[PDB]
Amino acid sequence: RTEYLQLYNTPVSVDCATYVCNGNSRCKQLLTQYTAACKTIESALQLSARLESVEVNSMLTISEEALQLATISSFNGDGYNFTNVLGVSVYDPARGRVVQKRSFIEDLLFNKVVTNGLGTVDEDYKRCSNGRSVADLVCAQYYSGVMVLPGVVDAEKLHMYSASLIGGMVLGGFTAAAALPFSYAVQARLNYLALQTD
Amino acid sequence: TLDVCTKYTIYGFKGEGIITLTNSSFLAGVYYTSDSGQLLAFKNVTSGAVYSVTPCSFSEQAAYVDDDIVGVISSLSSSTFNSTRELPGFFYHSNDGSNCTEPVLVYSNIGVCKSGSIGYVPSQSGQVKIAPTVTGNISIPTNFSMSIRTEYLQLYNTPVSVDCATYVCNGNSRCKQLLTQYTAACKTIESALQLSAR
Amino acid sequence: QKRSFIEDLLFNKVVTNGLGTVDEDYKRCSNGRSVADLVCAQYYSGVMVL
Amino acid sequence: VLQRNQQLLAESFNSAIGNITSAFESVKEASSQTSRGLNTVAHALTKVQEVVNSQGAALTQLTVQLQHNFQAISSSIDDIYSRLDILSADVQVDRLITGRLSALNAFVAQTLTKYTEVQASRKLAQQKVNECVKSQSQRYGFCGGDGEHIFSLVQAAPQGLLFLHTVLVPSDFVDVIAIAGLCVNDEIALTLREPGLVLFTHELQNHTATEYFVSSRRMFEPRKPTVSDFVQIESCVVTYVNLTRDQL
Amino acid sequence: VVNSQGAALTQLTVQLQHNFQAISSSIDDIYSRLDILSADVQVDRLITGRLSALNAFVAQTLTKYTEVQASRKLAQQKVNECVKSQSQRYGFCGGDGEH
Amino acid sequence: VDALIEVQGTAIQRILYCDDPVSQLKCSQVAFDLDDGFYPFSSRNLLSH
Amino acid sequence: VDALIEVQGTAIQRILYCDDPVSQLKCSQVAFDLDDGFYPFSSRNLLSH
Amino acid sequence: NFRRFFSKFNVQAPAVVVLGGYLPIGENQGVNSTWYCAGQHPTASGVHGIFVSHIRGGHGFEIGISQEPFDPSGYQLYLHKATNGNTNATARLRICQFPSIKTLGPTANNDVTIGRNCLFNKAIPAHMSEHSVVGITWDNDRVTVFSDKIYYFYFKNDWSRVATKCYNSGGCAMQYVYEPTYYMLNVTSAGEDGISYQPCTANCIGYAANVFATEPNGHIPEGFSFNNWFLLSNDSTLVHGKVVSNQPLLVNCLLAIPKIYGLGQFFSFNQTIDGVCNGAAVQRAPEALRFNINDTSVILAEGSIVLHTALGTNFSF
Ligand SMILES: *[C@@H]1O[C@H](CO)[C@@H](O[C@@H]2O[C@H](CO)[C@@H](O[C@@H]3O[C@H](CO[C@H]4O[C@H](CO)[C@@H](O)[C@H](O)[C@@H]4O)[C@@H](O)[C@H](O[C@H]4O[C@H](CO)[C@@H](O)[C@H](O)[C@@H]4O)[C@@H]3O)[C@H](O)[C@H]2NC(C)=O)[C@H](O)[C@H]1NC(C)=O
Ligand SMILES: *[C@@H]1O[C@H](CO)[C@@H](O[C@@H]2O[C@H](CO)[C@@H](O[C@@H]3O[C@H](CO[C@H]4O[C@H](CO)[C@@H](O)[C@H](O)[C@@H]4O)[C@@H](O)[C@H](O[C@H]4O[C@H](CO)[C@@H](O)[C@H](O)[C@@H]4O)[C@@H]3O)[C@H](O)[C@H]2NC(C)=O)[C@H](O)[C@H]1NC(C)=O
Ligand SMILES: *[C@@H]1O[C@H](CO)[C@@H](O[C@@H]2O[C@H](CO)[C@@H](O[C@@H]3O[C@H](CO[C@H]4O[C@H](CO)[C@@H](O)[C@H](O)[C@@H]4O)[C@@H](O)[C@H](O[C@H]4O[C@H](CO)[C@@H](O)[C@H](O)[C@@H]4O)[C@@H]3O)[C@H](O)[C@H]2NC(C)=O)[C@H](O)[C@H]1NC(C)=O
Ligand SMILES: *[C@@H]1O[C@H](CO)[C@@H](O[C@@H]2O[C@H](CO)[C@@H](O[C@@H]3O[C@H](CO[C@H]4O[C@H](CO)[C@@H](O)[C@H](O)[C@@H]4O)[C@@H](O)[C@H](O[C@H]4O[C@H](CO)[C@@H](O)[C@H](O)[C@@H]4O)[C@@H]3O)[C@H](O)[C@H]2NC(C)=O)[C@H](O)[C@H]1NC(C)=O
Ligand SMILES: *[C@@H]1O[C@H](CO)[C@@H](O[C@@H]2O[C@H](CO)[C@@H](O[C@@H]3O[C@H](CO[C@H]4O[C@H](CO)[C@@H](O)[C@H](O)[C@@H]4O)[C@@H](O)[C@H](O[C@H]4O[C@H](CO)[C@@H](O)[C@H](O)[C@@H]4O)[C@@H]3O)[C@H](O)[C@H]2NC(C)=O)[C@H](O)[C@H]1NC(C)=O
Ligand SMILES: *[C@@H]1O[C@H](CO[C@@H]2O[C@@H](C)[C@@H](O)[C@@H](O)[C@@H]2O)[C@@H](O[C@@H]2O[C@H](CO)[C@@H](O[C@@H]3O[C@H](CO)[C@@H](O)[C@H](O)[C@@H]3O)[C@H](O)[C@H]2NC(C)=O)[C@H](O)[C@H]1NC(C)=O
Ligand SMILES: *[C@@H]1O[C@H](CO[C@@H]2O[C@@H](C)[C@@H](O)[C@@H](O)[C@@H]2O)[C@@H](O[C@@H]2O[C@H](CO)[C@@H](O[C@@H]3O[C@H](CO)[C@@H](O)[C@H](O)[C@@H]3O)[C@H](O)[C@H]2NC(C)=O)[C@H](O)[C@H]1NC(C)=O
Ligand SMILES: *[C@@H]1O[C@H](CO)[C@@H](O[C@@H]2O[C@H](CO)[C@@H](O[C@@H]3O[C@H](CO)[C@@H](O)[C@H](O)[C@@H]3O)[C@H](O)[C@H]2NC(C)=O)[C@H](O)[C@H]1NC(C)=O
Ligand SMILES: *[C@@H]1O[C@H](CO)[C@@H](O[C@@H]2O[C@H](CO)[C@@H](O[C@@H]3O[C@H](CO)[C@@H](O)[C@H](O)[C@@H]3O)[C@H](O)[C@H]2NC(C)=O)[C@H](O)[C@H]1NC(C)=O
Ligand SMILES: *[C@@H]1O[C@H](CO[C@@H]2O[C@@H](C)[C@@H](O)[C@@H](O)[C@@H]2O)[C@@H](O[C@@H]2O[C@H](CO)[C@@H](O)[C@H](O)[C@H]2NC(C)=O)[C@H](O)[C@H]1NC(C)=O
Ligand SMILES: *[C@@H]1O[C@H](CO)[C@@H](O)[C@H](O)[C@H]1NC(C)=O
Ligand SMILES: *[C@@H]1O[C@H](CO)[C@@H](O)[C@H](O)[C@H]1NC(C)=O
Ligand SMILES: *[C@@H]1O[C@H](CO)[C@@H](O)[C@H](O)[C@H]1NC(C)=O
Ligand SMILES: *[C@@H]1O[C@H](CO)[C@@H](O)[C@H](O)[C@H]1NC(C)=O
């Protein structure tokens, strides 16, 4: 069976002063009479952002043993594939260090639902101030004052978290010479639910 | 005048900004506008060259600690602080280019120290639980201790009541006689209020 | 029975004395001869805090 | 039952309650990123501190819109009624009352909207107090988190309750070999019955130490096995040791 | 849901172009063409309308934050109980069958 | 000039000017003391007229 | 006449008239292709003047 | 001695100011009675101000405050710093609720009303010298720190007893003052060299609460009661609260104790006023005029003022 759930939402910030006035002095002098609404909205915005960021960063739990065992070589499949699920190891980018990339199914689903160049990827705001180009929509609300905060969690963090989570079952004893076969775990679960003689 | 901040009056619209030349080709229209009412792009009809305008002002964020402005984050390479460090997507400005090992203000994977240095927050490592096994090697836990956790929950809220008749009229007779035409809203609001309270 | 240590600490930490948490005596609003506070303002307006 | 565990646990509990009570005061003096994590004192205090002002708010602004004038000469109905003819004054006060009633309609809509989530949260809270406190839950990490639940304390808090769950946490691990089962005469499989118990051998026969003990999968209590804890199977596997009647 | 979460931002720019019973939506245009008095009144109307609109927007924001809070609580519960261990409740994990 | 005024019993005390970005932020939140955190600021454009 | 126009770089392409109930539904959703489903329609009343 | 103490706070050269407070007078100048509280005409109200000049042990300096009424709801003051070095003399200063002991010394319980943590927690530099002393003074809501540059803190609390952790101190090393004194200060040197500190004779209270010090940037100096000042309001007044608005506060020049307007003094809204400024001066066109009225009868009897409009209309009062 399949199931899908959400945990976080994209936060946004804005400055009321620049949004309501485009740098004029007399207008902001007039605005100074009524400002408590601006304080209320911004207090709510940054407070809500900070609390959820703190709690979501506290939510994650990471194990290095699962990182070691998440590779294809470290996994001993026995009658089971676990290929489209397990990630692809030994990747050497310009950084020069081995990194983990997307596996089959998830890389399919990102390119299916998410079009390249959409708002899911982080947006470089330097080009907005660079100039000499026809401004896109993002620069429009950048000038307006709407700031789209960077994602609290990176997609790579989610992928490595998933790799760590899926490796918990194969985690046997500490400093295991070889990973325990999945069939043994299946037998263990079958025996746990009820005794068997076959 | 080009490439300077200036008060411009183009085609009946007056604004403030820096005007620049763009290498775009378009054979339709004389000016181009966005959904914000800003005439960013206009064409030199005699030559066909296109120009784009950007405001002389910007909105940026700052990190305030103790009693002074320490962190400045922006998209411009010029700042009061001596050190300007380019980071993926933006510019950071500070007076120290040293390491940041004990950040005070942390968000997502980015942390800023009191001294002004910036850095990447290391990923938090969570607890470990041993997966079920039926053979081989088991790490049986022992030598336990206490960990007291906190939790807070709400169960009730303060109720409030109001009389619409006295709120909308301060005891006048003709006003309430006029109000008698439309009263079902008052009945609805009070029926909701006392029922929910009870 | 009165408050113990931890809870008596937390009430006086988060709740300032004379705030809206404590029950409000509405008799003083009708008593008069004093500069009316904010509570009497919405009492006259019609807002009743149960 | 040698009572050193009891005193160690008690002194650890006293030290822990002492330092958590200390952490209630001036938490920011030496607070770390871990100290402000989930299910921590700092998170609870900041949550309650913000929510108390949040619930105490949203009433002051209700008075504000009364002063607002809705395309009328003045916001005082008595002022308007005694200075201008009845017709336009009636029209203007109709505009005033319509705007005011719409504003309070929005207000009352917000009210039961607030009532909904407190209904749901109070349902969850009564469930949790019914299940995590008066009895023992068998779900790992449900009470408190990432650990077995022993007991909890309940304290009154402004506009709610506070839970103080005591979680037992391990600190050391014992690594021993395990044995799957036994076959005598390689037809009678003597196998343990309850999965929660496990049979192990402390070390090996390297120095004649083939002693067998049985214990739970979380507690290290090496004890002699009992006949009633095992069952007989007609089928045997390679992994089972092929013992004899003399060594039984 | 991905388009639902990606939406509800574009319309925020729209009401800026809307004119609130004023000569024009550009405050700079109005300020330099008419006397300070009626221009100040009109810009007061503009700022009041704009602040009310963003008040509605921010009210919608934490309103959205509430249900994602609740759903994330449920999700962390489910990942704690249906994955790392074995649940004894029939149909709880997945449905109508043992997990 | 523009400044933050706090009144207690019709008594003038605790004056605070706003001719400074730090002062501008301080009197943008009508608080003498501000907690540590992140706040928005607008680029200066009054130098040249 | 009334029709749906799609512009890409100030180029006129993919014209589509609306003198048909199917065409009216098509240009009521500014989409060249419409997914299968249920949609509302208004009875014709322009035949008789 | 007194020169260093007066030079701790900066004052413009063309300025004369009268200071009133519990200034140091003598090493052992103390009360002749045992009263420590305050009432009608209070003089022996305990140590109103304490000053430290010397040590016998040298381990360090510590100060703390308390009160006989013993109200645990308010704050408490505790400071500690190390002597034998100017750099090491960084005083750690704390206006916090310290649990301490209900009595003197570790013999009793602590304060059970301390829910919140603290308000003031700072490190302030200090210097050690024979003629340089470090002091604290409390008076009603105001509390002032005589160390380096001046401090003004606003909080309503009560204190009547002073405690020092370092008991190894002589009688003359510590100096406690309990009676306010008035002194006229005149420093025509733009520096630490003060001309004189002659005590004031008459109109001392009025002079203290009316004379300013024109800062070079034009800002008003801190430490003023503003008794003769009110907010500029067209209608109504805020009973209590906070607000930001444009107000007439920036000053170009100040004239006090005047004599020349009895000769028909003329002011123009265009040209800068002429007179002996109270310190620094700024060459700017005036925007508004503020008048601090001492006696109404002087204006009523022979005071004659005429308002000259831009049109030329004359308005005689
Ligand atoms: C960077 O931008 C700033 C402002 O925008 C400019 O101004 C200062 O430049 C100095 C030069 O590096 C920096 O501050 C100095 O740091 C020195 C070393 O720092 C260590 O030691 C101090 C304690 O002394 C610690 O607080 C700190 O965390 C480090 O551990 C200090 O030795 C300096 O103190 C000296 O200051 C003056 C001038 O040199 C001397 O006369 C004193 O006697 C004293 O010895 C000083 O604190 C820092 O960059 C800026 N300071 C501040 C407060 O912002 C710089 O010009 C600009 N460029 C560079 C390269 O800094
Ligand atoms: C969790 O449990 C599983 C299930 O048993 C273990 O898997 C086997 O574990 C046993 C015991 O832990 C292993 O036996 C051990 O082999 C290790 C290999 O190191 C030496 O191996 C040869 C043997 O002579 C040497 O030549 C070589 O140089 C290595 O130094 C050693 O720890 C032991 O072998 C001998 O090591 C030294 C050096 O010779 C001697 O002095 C010792 O006395 C000892 O005789 C030991 O015998 C077995 O190899 C494991 N097999 C497999 C397939 O995993 C896991 O290892 C265990 N997890 C742990 C321990 O982290
Ligand atoms: C659960 O917790 C218990 C209690 O701490 C642990 O038992 C301890 O285990 C550690 C390591 O295994 C021991 O540390 C060292 O043990 C050596 C041998 O232990 C014997 O002797 C000690 C007395 O020294 C007895 O307490 C113990 O029961 C054994 O009989 C010692 O020789 C070592 O001595 C070193 O430290 C001492 C100071 O303690 C110095 O004076 C010595 O000179 C030398 O430097 C050392 O103590 C520890 O002793 C054990 N304590 C007890 C009370 O048994 C369990 O191991 C742990 N369970 C786990 C980890 O799975
Ligand atoms: C206690 O004692 C019992 C009894 O010996 C052990 O159980 C195993 O019993 C079997 C049967 O007597 C022993 O023989 C092994 O049989 C395995 C399966 O049977 C196959 O036999 C033939 C030949 O392989 C197949 O054609 C046929 O289809 C059956 O499927 C085989 O897998 C073993 O073959 C191994 O050796 C041959 C060479 O003889 C190689 O060619 C193979 O590739 C393979 O390596 C073997 O024939 C078996 O030896 C017994 N196990 C052990 C470990 O000895 C219990 O295991 C034992 N308990 C303990 C703890 O030692
Ligand atoms: C109580 O009620 C009274 C009404 O009696 C209000 O008084 C008004 O206050 C405002 C605010 O100062 C006055 O407005 C001012 O008008 C000046 C005169 O305008 C001339 O100059 C401008 C160019 O600046 C021309 O465009 C115009 O046509 C006129 O020729 C303005 O100059 C003022 O703006 C500038 O003033 C100075 C001048 O350098 C600058 O330093 C400022 O920064 C600013 O840019 C200003 O707009 C108005 O005239 C007053 N009316 C009357 C009748 O006196 C009170 O404000 C009100 N509230 C209180 C608390 O008293
Ligand atoms: C410090 O106190 C002295 C004394 O002034 C006395 O008190 C004042 C309140 C007035 O009542 C004075 O009349 C009275 O004497 C003052 O400083 C000194 O003031 C004298 C003025 O008598 C200055 O002499 C002047 O010298 C110039 C140049 O020769 C002449 O043109 C003047 O006519 C006058 O004679 C003297 O220079 C001045 N010296 C110093 C060091 O201040 C002053 O009143 C007061 N300081 C300040 C800043 O007010
Ligand atoms: C100060 O007053 C003068 C004159 O204006 C007078 O006062 C006004 C309040 C009105 O009531 C007027 O009706 C009345 O006549 C003004 O200053 C004059 O203009 C400039 C300003 O600095 C100065 O001289 C000028 O220099 C330029 C450059 O060379 C010439 O082009 C001008 O023709 C003029 O000479 C000088 O201050 C003064 N000049 C003269 C001849 O009076 C000003 O309006 C006012 N406010 C200020 C100076 O801030
Ligand atoms: C329970 O926790 C407390 C600390 O929270 C442990 O120590 C107790 O501390 C208080 C305050 O320090 C002691 O109060 C005493 O009051 C007398 C006056 O009546 C005063 O003279 C003392 O100096 C002290 O302030 C209290 O007596 C003390 N409790 C003791 C010594 O038993 C306490 O030990 C913890 N109890 C257990 C069983 O662990
Ligand atoms: C009302 O106020 C105006 C000023 O706002 C007065 O105007 C000024 O009046 C004085 C004397 O009345 C004039 O002084 C004269 O100057 C000439 C030289 O020009 C001199 O010969 C005379 O002896 C005298 O000193 C001054 O010039 C004049 N200023 C202006 C701008 O007109 C007016 O007098 C006042 N009304 C009354 C009734 O006094
Ligand atoms: C001290 O800093 C240098 C570089 O400065 C910064 O370092 C990090 C805090 C991060 O913010 C970088 O982007 C800054 O440039 C460190 O050198 C970097 O080290 C990281 C990993 O530690 C590596 O990914 C970068 O490629 C390195 N960059 C360069 C130019 O060498 C250095 O490691 C820091 N030292 C310590 C002890 O943390
Ligand atoms: C436009 O031409 C190229 C890209 O087409 C670019 O490198 C160049 O700088 C541009 N020239 C301008 C903007 O004048
Ligand atoms: C727990 O409290 C004791 C004192 O009772 C203290 O020594 C210890 O450091 C505290 N533990 C932690 C983790 O703070
Ligand atoms: C400074 O020096 C003094 C010398 O008496 C010493 O007592 C004190 O501890 C020192 N402080 C620091 C911070 O080095
Ligand atoms: C000021 O008034 C006095 C009244 O005593 C008078 O003698 C004097 O001449 C007046 N001054 C001027 C300049 O008119």
Author numbering:
A (entry chain C): 793 to 990
B (entry chain B): 645 to 842
C (entry chain B): 892 to 941
D (entry chain B): 991 to 1238
E (entry chain C): 1041 to 1139
F (entry chain B), G (entry chain C): 447 to 495
H (entry chain B): 31 to 347
Authors' account:
To obtain further insights into the structure and dynamics of the PEDV S at a higher resolution, we collected cryo-EM data from the same batch of viral particles. The particles were refined with a C3 symmetry followed by symmetry expansion to extract further information with regard to the local motions within individual protomers. The set of S trimer particles with all three protomers in the D0-down conformation was refined with C3 symmetry, resulting in a D0DDD map with a global resolution of 4.7 Å. 68% of the final S trimer particles corresponded to the D0DDD arrangement. The atomic models corresponding to the PEDV S in the D0DDD and D0UDD arrangements were built. The D0-down state has the D0 tucked against the S2 subunit, while in the D0-up state, the lifted D0 adopts a propeller-like conformation. Despite the moderate resolutions of our cryo-EM maps, we observed well-defined secondary structure elements and bulky side chains, with clear protrusions from the asparagine side chains at 21 out of 23 putative N-glycosylation sites, which we attributed as the glycan structures. In contrast, the D0-down conformation exhibited a cluster of N-glycans on Asn726, Asn873, and Asn118, which made extensive contact with the D0 and S2 subunit. Despite the discrepancy between cryo-ET and cryo-EM in terms of the absolute proportions of the individual states, it is clear that the D0-down conformation is energetically more favorable than the D0-up conformation.
